[PDB]
Amino acid sequence: GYQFDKGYISPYFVTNPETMEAVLEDAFILIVEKKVSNVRELLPILEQVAQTGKPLLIIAEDVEGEALATLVVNKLRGTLSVAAVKAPGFGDRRKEMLKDIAAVTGGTVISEELGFKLENATLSMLGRAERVRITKDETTIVGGK
């Protein structure tokens, strides 16, 4: 499995309060280099995943504000099975680890600095994994595709 030392951004993402873990199976993986704050650029890809019924892990520099609130209310209501974690590291080390995660999961790194806008993402840009386990402190990606 591929592990990294950042856990869930919000404890509302837990799925098993016995273990205080979030466990996502047959999940899509959205890998975003930037900070996500505005709901509007996340809606398009959330709509696309919602119709699939499969879970989604978002890895971003951070997820805050209205975008975070949106994720929390949809998870608590059972409308989406989602979790978000911060990208590990900073600077070139962060960019290296996002590349490794994309490679392991078959996804594409959505990088604003290279010109890609999040509102334009599609399901084919998402990575996939058989299982994701997230604690307060770490994320493990198992069976990346």
Say which experimental method was used.
X-ray
**CATH of 1-145 given 3.40.50.2300, 3.50.7.10, 3.10.150.10, 3.50.50.60:** 3.50.7.10
Assigned token pair, 90: 């900073």
Radius of gyration over every alpha carbon of the chain, rounded to an integer in angstroms: 14
Sequence-distant (6+) residues with CB within 8 A of 85 are 6, 7, 8, 9, 57, 58, 59, 134, 139
* 58 backbone φψ class: left, alpha, beta (φ>0; ψ -120 to 50): beta
Asked if 123 contacts 28 with a C-beta cutoff of 8 angstroms, the reply is: yes
Ranges of each domain in the chain = 1-145
N- to C-terminal Cα separation, the chain: 12
Asked if 87 contacts 97 with a C-beta cutoff of 8 angstroms, the reply is: yes
At residue 64, what is the residue type? E
